[PDB]
Amino acid sequence: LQDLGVANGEDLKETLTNCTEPLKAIEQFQTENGVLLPSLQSALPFLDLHGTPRLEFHQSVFDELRDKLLERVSAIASEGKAEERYKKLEDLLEKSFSLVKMPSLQPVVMCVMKHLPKVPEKKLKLVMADKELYRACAVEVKRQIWQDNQALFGDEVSPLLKQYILEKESALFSTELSVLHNFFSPSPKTRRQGEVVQRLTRMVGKNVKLYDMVLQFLRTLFLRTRNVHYCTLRAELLMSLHDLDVGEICTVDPCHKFTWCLDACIRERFVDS
Amino acid sequence: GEDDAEVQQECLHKFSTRDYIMESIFNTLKRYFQAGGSPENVIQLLSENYTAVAQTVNLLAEWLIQTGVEPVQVQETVENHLKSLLIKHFDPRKADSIFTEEGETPAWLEQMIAHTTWRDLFYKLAEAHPDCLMLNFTVKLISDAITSVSTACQQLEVFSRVLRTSLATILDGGEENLEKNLPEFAKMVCHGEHTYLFAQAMMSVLAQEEQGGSAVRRIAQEVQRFAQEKGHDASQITLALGTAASYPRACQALGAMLSKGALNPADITVLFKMFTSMDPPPVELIRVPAFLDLFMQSLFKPGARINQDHKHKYIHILAYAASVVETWKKNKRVSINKDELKSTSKAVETVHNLCCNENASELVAELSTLYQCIRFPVVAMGVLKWVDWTVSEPRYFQLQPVHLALLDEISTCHQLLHPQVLQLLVKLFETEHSQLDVMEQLELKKTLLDRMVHLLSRGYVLPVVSYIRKCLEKDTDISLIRYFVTEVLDVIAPPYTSDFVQLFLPILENDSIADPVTEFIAHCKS
C-alpha cells in the first residue's frame, strides 16, 4: 500500500499504539481507507445495521470491478490508438506491479505483459524468480523472458525432454504382443496430442528465436545420445506449430512442406508416387 | 443458567468468522465484554481475518476510473446490486419494526428519497403493502412531496381532497394529459362502491353546470368504464342517477343490458315498444357509450345470435338513438324530430348486412353506397369496429388490404373520429408477422404512415407527431421516420406552425434527407 502512498497494518497499529484516544484513531483509519464516494459515508451505518458489513458490498464490487479491469486490459490491448493504448497499459503496469505481491493484481498484470511485445525485463526476471509468478504468468510473459534469455527455457525443457525420453523408453519396452495392435500404430499426429510437445508449442508460440532454441537443445542431446527420439520431437514440434497454423515457422521454414509430406507418408507408411 | 457459555460463542462466531469487524459488532462486543472471558483475543480475532476488501475496492474502483470508462457506469452497477439485494432481502416485518422504534424514519430515509432509484424502490415496496405502517407512511408522504388507494378511501376527507385535486389536474389536462391524470383518480374511485357512488353523484351534480359540466359527465362515464374494467356493475348507479326513474321499463331494460355487458331481444323489444309508442322516452336515456358499443359488437362482429324479426328492431332503436332531436323546454321534450330516422336506419341496415356477411372485392363493388352511407356518423363507427375486428385478426394483411382505405372517408368527413382512427392505426403500425416478412411489415407500416400523414393534414397534428416521437425514441426504425418526413414534406404546404415544428423538427434531427428536408429545417428554424 505504501508504494502509492497508502497505509498498511503496521501503520494502523502505530496509529493505535500509545494513544490516549484509540477509538477515534480507529475511526480516522476507517475514514482514510474507505471507498471515497459521498453517498457511502452516510449509507455505511445504515447498511451496517442490517447485519451486512461494509466489506461485503466491498467484496461484491471487488469482483465486479476487477472483472471489468481485466476486460479493459484486453480492450486497451485491442482498443485505442497504438501509442496511447500502450502508454495506458504500461502506466497501469507501473501502478499495478506493486500489488502483484498481493493476491489480486497478479493475473491482470500478467495479461498486460501478455499484450506488450517487449517490457523492461526487471519484472520478467521477478516472474521467473518467484515460483507463484512462474506458475500464473501468461504465455507471452514466459516467451519474453525466453526471447531475452535462454536460462528458463533450458531449465523447463530439460524435464520435459526427460519425460519425452521416459515415454519413449517405457513404450518401446512394453510387453504386449497381439494380432490386434502394436505401439507403432499411432500416427505422428496421434502422438502430437500428448501435452509435452503441444505445451512446447505453446512455450514457443509463433516465435522463431524459441524455435531456434528448441532446435539447438534437441541438436545437443541428439549429438550426445545418438537416439532418434529428439529427431521425432523436432518433427512433432514443427507439425504441432502447423497444427496451430503457425505462419511464423511454417512459411519460412524450408523443412515445413517436406515434413508435412512425410506426415502423410508415415500415416500410410509408404512413399506413394 | 448463565448464558455466557452460549452467548459468548454467539458473539465469537461473528468475531472469528471471516471479515466481520466493520459492522451489531458493537452490541455483541458489549455483550461479551459484560460477559467477561477473553476480551483481548476478541480484537485479534476481528483484525485477524480483516482481508482489507475495502482497500482492494479502492484500488479497483480508482483503476476503473483511470481507464477512462464512465464512473456513472460504476454508480449504476453498485446501485443496481444493492437495490436488488434489498428487494430480495426486504422484510416487511422489519419495516414495521423501524416504524415501531420511531414513527418517522430517521434521516437515512430522507437522504435516500433524494435518489430517484430509491424513490422507485419505496414505490415498489409500498404499492403492494396496504397495511405496513412504514410503507404506507412513505408512499403517502412521497405523494405529499401514487397515493395508495387503501389510504385514499380510508375516510371521506382524504378521498375528497385527493379527488378534487386530481380532477383539477384532469380538467387542466385538456384532452391529452387525462391519460396520466385520470387513472390515479380512477383507480382511487374504483376500489369500493361507496367511494364510487359518492364520486359518481358529485360528478353528476357538477355535470349540471352548463359552463363545462359536459366534461365532468365525460369523466364520470370514463370512471364508470374503468369500474366495469374492474368487474363491477354500475348499471343501477346510472339508472337512479339519470332519468331512468322517469321510466321504469327503460330503467330495468337498459340496466339489465348494461349489467350483463351484452344485449338481448327482450330488453331491446321493451325499448322498441317504448320508442314506437306515442310517448318515446328521452333519447338521452339510451345515449350511453358502452350501450352503443354493445350495439356495435352485436351488429358488426361475426355473429352474434340474431333473429330477423329483431334485427330491424336493434337497427331502429340505434337509428332512434343516433337520429332523433328532442328539444328541452326547461327539461321538457316538446319537439321530436324523427325525419332523419328512416334514412339512418336504412343505411345502418345495409351496412350491417354487408358487415355480418364477412366481406374485400365485394366491398369495392358496393363502395359507392358505402361512401354514400359513411356520411352517417353511427354507420361510420359501425364500419370502423367491423374493419377493426377483421384487420385485428393475426395475419389479415396476407389476404385482402382494402379496409384501410375506408378510414380515409371516415376521418376526412368526420372530424371527431380523428382520435379513433389514429388510435386504431397505433395498433396497426405495430403489426409484426413472421409469415409476412419485415419487408412486408415495413410496407404496411409505411402505408399506415401515409394514412397518418393524411390524418395529420386534417388537423390532428399534436398527438400524431407526439406518438411518432415516442415510438422513434422507443420500435419505429429510422427508415420509417424518414419515409414519414418524406411524405409529410411532400404533402404539407407552408407556413408550419410552431406547435407542429416543436415535435416534428427535433425528431427530424436524426436525418437530413427524404432536398425538401433542408428547406423545411431552414424555414422552421428561421
A129 and chain B: CB distance < 8 Å anywhere? no
Contact B57 A62 (CB under 8 A): yes
Q: Which three cell numbers stand for residue A92?
A: 497501469
For residue A129, how many C-alpha atoms fall within 13 Å in the half-sphere facing its CB?
Answer: 7
CA gap B519, B489 in Å, rounded? 9
Collect all residues with Cβ–Cβ distance below 8 Å to A98 and sequence separation of at least 6. Answer: A3, A4
Report helix, strand or coil for A155: helix
Answer whether B181's CB lies under 8 Å from B165's CB. no
Residues A110, A141: Cα–Cα separation, whole Å: 7
* Distance in angstroms (rounded) separating the CA atoms of residues B80 and A148: 48
Which residue among A39, A43, A54 sits closest to B22, beta carbon to beta carbon?
A: A54
Q: Cα–Cα distances in Å, from B409 out to B121, B335, B381, B383, B453?
A: 49, 33, 12, 11, 15
B415/B460 Cα distance (integer angstroms): 9
Cα–Cα nearest to B150, from B120, B113, B188, B117: B188
Pairing, β B333-337 against β B325-328:
antiparallel
8 Å CB contact between A217 and A210: no
Phi, then psi, of A28 in degrees rounded to 5 = -65, -40
Which residues partner with B337 through β-bridges? B325
CA atoms within 13 A on the CB side of B385: 19
A chain contacts of residue B52, beta-carbon cutoff 8 Å: 33
Q: Which helix (H) or strand (E) holds B337?
A: strand B333-337
Residue to test with chain A: of B11, B43, B67, most A Cβ within 10 A: B67
The neighbouring-strand residues paired with B335 are B327
Instruction: Mark out the alpha helices in B230-307 (DSSP H runs).
Output: 235-241, 248-260, 265-276, 283-286, 289-300
In contact, B101 and B94? CB cutoff 8 Å: no
Contact check, Cβ <8 Å, A68/B64: yes
Q: Are B78 and A65 in contact (CB under 8 A)?
A: no
Q: What sign does the dihedral A175-A176-A177-A182 (CA atoms) show?
A: negative
Are A96 and B63 within 8 A, CB to CB?
yes
Q: How many CB atoms lie within 10 A of CB A15?
A: 16
Could you give the CA distance from residue B475 to residue B428 in angstroms, rounded to a whole number? 13
Q: Which residues of A touch B51 (CB under 8 A)?
A: 55
Residues of A in contact with B56 (CB under 8 A): 58, 62, 104
* Residues with Cβ within 8 Å of residue B478, at least 6 apart in sequence: B472, B510, B511
Q: Which residues of B touch A58 (CB under 8 A)?
A: 53-54, 56-57
Measured over the CA atoms of residue B374, residue B376, residue B381 and residue B385, the dihedral's sign is: negative
Burial tier of B53 (Cβ tally within 10 Å: 0-12, 13-18, 19+): buried
CA distance A103 to chain B (A): 10
Mind spelling out the 3-state secondary structure of B473-494?
HCCCCHHHHHHHHHHHHHHCCC
* Helices (H), ranges, B357-437: 361-365, 367-373, 377-391, 403-413, 418-428
Distances (CA, A) of A6 to A19, A32, A33, B46: 21, 9, 8, 22
Contacting residues of A for B108, CB less than 8 Å apart: 42-43, 45-46
Exposure on the CB side of residue A239, measured as CA atoms within 13 A: 21
Return d(Cα B140, Cα B151) in angstroms, integer. Answer: 8
3-state secondary structure A64-107: HHHHHHHHHHHHHHHCCCHHHHHHHHHHHHHHHHHHCCCCCCHH
Which amino acid, one-letter code, is at B24?
Answer: S
* Maximal CA-CA distance, chain A: 95
- Within the 11-30 window of chain A, which residues sit less than 8 Å (CB to CB) from chain B? 30
Q: Give the H/E segment covering residue A214.
A: helix A208-225
Q: Residue B485, Cβ neighbours under 10 Å: how many?
A: 25
Asked if B416 has any chain A CB less than 8 Å from its own CB, the reply is no
Query: Is residue B149 within 8 Å of residue B164, measured between CB atoms?
Result: no
Orientation of helix A9-16 relative to helix A22-32, angle to 10°: 150
| Maximal C-alpha separation, chain B | 105
